[PDB]
Design a protein around this ligand. Structure first.
Ligand SMILES: [Cl-]
Ligand SMILES: [Cl-]
Ligand SMILES: [Cl-]
Ligand SMILES: [Cl-]
Ligand SMILES: [Cl-]
Ligand SMILES: [Cl-]
Ligand SMILES: [Cl-]
Ligand SMILES: [Cl-]
Ligand SMILES: [Cl-]
Ligand SMILES: [Cl-]
Ligand SMILES: [Cl-]
Ligand SMILES: [Cl-]
Ligand SMILES: [Cl-]
Ligand SMILES: [Cl-]
Ligand SMILES: [Cl-]
Ligand SMILES: [Cl-]
Ligand SMILES: [Cl-]
Ligand SMILES: [Cl-]
Ligand SMILES: [Cl-]
Ligand SMILES: [Cl-]
Ligand SMILES: [Cl-]
Ligand SMILES: [Cl-]
Ligand SMILES: [Cl-]
Lengths: 135, 136, 137, 137, 135, 135, 135, 138, 138, 138
């Protein structure tokens, strides 16, 4: 009835098909930084936003790892008193600032290599209290 | 799948009636901190989370003001390899840290006065770069 | 009896006078654990509330009665100028830490938000250099 | 029914007679610090406390100046769940920390010079927000 | 014609009569700041100065305590090349900055309660090395 | 009767004879630091003390300059509740800390070239408020 | 006879053909960071190294920008007294440490998008004095 | 080794193996460095000195001269063109070391060679530091 | 042999050259304990005195010979110009701390004030980065 | 020049003026110091390097060599005896200059010379700072 989180996967063939190439690149580029850091807490993310929801879905399905986990496609609120064109967003959660920076670079690399991909705005995010993403 | 953002409000007549009481309380309680301070950028939020999406949807509909704006009901990722019970969440965006604390306090106040309402966990949130929430 | 006396304490919710009781109930729930006394703490904080209606202040005094949050009686600020002008009544709500003090302040703000007939009180956190005699033996 | 603030004075003769010696000494001792200065906000006080309401009342009536102004005799709450003997208090409001320390010293001087006067405890007090003791405007 | 220091007392009966009222006020007002703190060094004072040596003398005789001890009535030198009206001074020696300040306060108090009394100018004084006033 | 301050003098002929030698030395050694400086307040001194009042009187009489001015011979209070043997002192006022150190050194120099004469203990002194010694 | 630097080039057609894909990617991923900053000194680089000189040549030819400039394919010294197999290296010169890190990521990303590319070791480099790369 | 690409200087055991025209410079350095020229096994290869200028032969002799246990020159290389066209080349040689102090002695040593041989070119230079160690270890 | 020698050391006032002995006696008393060696400190300070009269400087040099305060011989500062101009003599008085160095300056200033025939010497405190070899061989 | 006292080294304007046994050292320093060897006319004389050792003749060549517009050695002087008895003399030469950078370069120049010449004495030295400027302008 309501939004639902991306379903997780260990095997690359579980990743939806059209996000698969983005997923693979992310796995190779993130490397060890993609792995759950047992030590740290989940107090970081990167928020990506732009106008195309389908682009963001792929990004959300591509960013699913031990230490890097995206939520579903969401929205920013309308900016003004009235309705305007929607800005969608995905939060890519992770454990430390450095991983969060690498997530940003990762997507920017994907964009660089795919001129037809949306150029997403982004920001590093930090949470005062830890999020419940432990196993 | 694809969410839309809560509709904004002209008059309280435009707030969904199930959230109207929560909304009116927040309007009075936030007072001036609920008004848009164009002097500021949008670099803060509060994230509320819990297991009950209806609770969160009323919260979301309730927090719709000039300087305090909720996103729709959303989700955190599954924490592990397999699927666990869903943790829903709502981000309430605002323009400064003081307001983000007032937002947490508003919700605690509502909860105190309504022992049946869900006791939501939350966290203050800070963004490095400002969000596109300025008025056109 | 020419002098003020301190508010009486409660052994149960129903000992709070009825007109102030709902406000007291909301405070008990909202303050929660922080309403409780911390016998390892000293008393060097308060929130002063002030306004024009002494009966409103009396209910706020009656409502703020807990182990770690205790209102004095309805009192007054001095006149600001050379002649008697409208009275600003005030109540001090004594607390054990700054945190609880801001919570006290928020509690009343919530109360007012949820009850429009309630007076819109002004307030300020207050800090004492020395500990007040509010400890037990 | 409700407490009232001390009446403010235009001339020494308007001061209640029993408090008038204390008022004159404070007027002379405080000197310039007893006057209002328009450069400052009302964010300080001295709280005096003891078991003697009449002694406090003279103190309260004595400290009525442009820049130093006492509240009425009030009470601190009971320390415990049971009533205990009343501790009375007076807040003497000032515009700055130095004036607040001078007020404590003033009263210590008064005690030193009058062995029959009670020995009051006190604390300096700081308010995060300014109190409404300025004139309208 | 050499100056001598004022006489010390043990009893209040030992204070010269004309200085006794001021002495008893100071004894009461200074309280325990008035008494000697043996683990402390004498590196402070209050200098009082004005035009009336008689008022200063009583002040001198008044401030005689374990931790607060006045020297005799003395003088500032002349301010200019020629002789001008004499400015008398008395140093009241203390062991800390707090007591100094209280000494200033003590005498202001005395002045507020006696309009006839001289309104003496004063300064806190600090000595880099300790004075020989330990017993 | 009460103490008076040393008589100021500008010509070395107006200096009391017993102190002329000291004075001539201090005049040359203090050099420019002996001169008054209007852009400075009078918030410093050196206090000299010891058991011999005549020694201190010469010093008092010697240190009379534009920017360096001694009070008369005075005393410190007795250290205890019984009368002790007197410690005398003289304050030499001046405008800055540097000059006060110079004044100290000047007297040590004098002690060094007159080894038979008595030694004085000293301390640099600082006043919170400026003393009334401008013209 | 002596080594020569890579050809600089304005438009992509002047880029050697084999380096053009890597150059385009870099041009897009570096973004503004690829541009010169005349108010910045050349005191950074990334040194890339590996055993395939042809791989290094393409990287060398690809990193030719206003603010990011590669030297030619060079060598590290033999590490021992005997000749062993050669470790080639290319220095990619930059005007700040952030650009350096970005150059490093740019190649990692290239390696993540082409599993056939060699996997170059690399290091940020810091120069005490500025190199003569000013316009 | 690949014929289309630079090779590193041949390393050498006795002084006689140094290329004839480098040898004096080499002997001079060997004396000036003393024991600083030896492999310091407690240290990682994280430093160099870069020498640069416009005469490649001058740099080639320096390159050939600086081959010791703990200081190893790469071959004559180049900086990239500073601008949009080919312009006069600046050649360079990196002389690798294990620590800052050895890197300063290399720099000093060359300064000495120049002050004592006025035909030698006056090479610009800089200390260089690497975040990760280079593969110059045993 | 034919180079400058330091002042001959003497720890008995009568062994001080007679012409410097009054200046010596005054310095010994005025420096007091500051005049003694403190093994705990190192020799990283001095006062340089200079002037055009080498004899006045010679007496100063002879006068300042103490355990913790020790003058070198009368020396010179270089010619300022490309050509020779009238000589500026100097004496370094070595000390173990800054306080003692200022005292040394005050000492000579005192001597000048009490002896108007004495030259007025300019001086400067001096600080050395590294310790001079003035510790006792032990 | 009073014959009882030291005098400053003779200044040059041309290298044939340099005492022959110091000429090698002199030229080497002129080249090593380069620009830093000349008078920096926006600066006062408040630095030096003191060199010391037991061989006065080596120090004398050093004194003679360090003569430039911005680096100027005094004569061979010495330190005081360290103890209350005559012991072996430690000779010293101050090499004056206008800023701390020049003084570090002076120090390095000598060091580079020594590293280059196994027969040269290994002189100890220290940088030196004067609180007031020395009269080396005129
Ligand atoms: Cl960001
Ligand atoms: Cl975890
Ligand atoms: Cl939080
Ligand atoms: Cl109320
Ligand atoms: Cl009440
Ligand atoms: Cl209501
Ligand atoms: Cl407040
Ligand atoms: Cl009244
Ligand atoms: Cl009383
Ligand atoms: Cl207090
Ligand atoms: Cl003062
Ligand atoms: Cl004497
Ligand atoms: Cl002192
Ligand atoms: Cl003046
Ligand atoms: Cl690195
Ligand atoms: Cl540039
Ligand atoms: Cl060459
Ligand atoms: Cl460098
Ligand atoms: Cl002679
Ligand atoms: Cl010795
Ligand atoms: Cl003489
Ligand atoms: Cl100096
Ligand atoms: Cl050094």
């Amino acid at each position: 009835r309501y939004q639902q989180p991306p379903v997780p996967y260990r095997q690359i063939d579980d990743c939806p098909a059209k996000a698969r190439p983005q997923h693979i690149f992310y796995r190779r580029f993130l490397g060890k930084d993609g792995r759950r850091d047992p030590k740290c807490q989940w107090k970081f993310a990167v928020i990506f936003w732009g106008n195309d929801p389908y682009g963001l879905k792929k990004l959300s399905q591509a960013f699913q790892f031990g230490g890097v986990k995206a939520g579903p496609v969401s929205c920013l609120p309308h900016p003004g008193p009235d309705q305007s064109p929607i800005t969608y967003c995905v939060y890519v959660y992770c454990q430390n600032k450095d991983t969060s920076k690498k997530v940003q670079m990762a997507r920017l690399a994907w964009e660089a290599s795919h001129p037809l991909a949306g150029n997403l705005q982004s920001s590093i995010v930090k949470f005062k209290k830890p999020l419940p993403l432990t196993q």
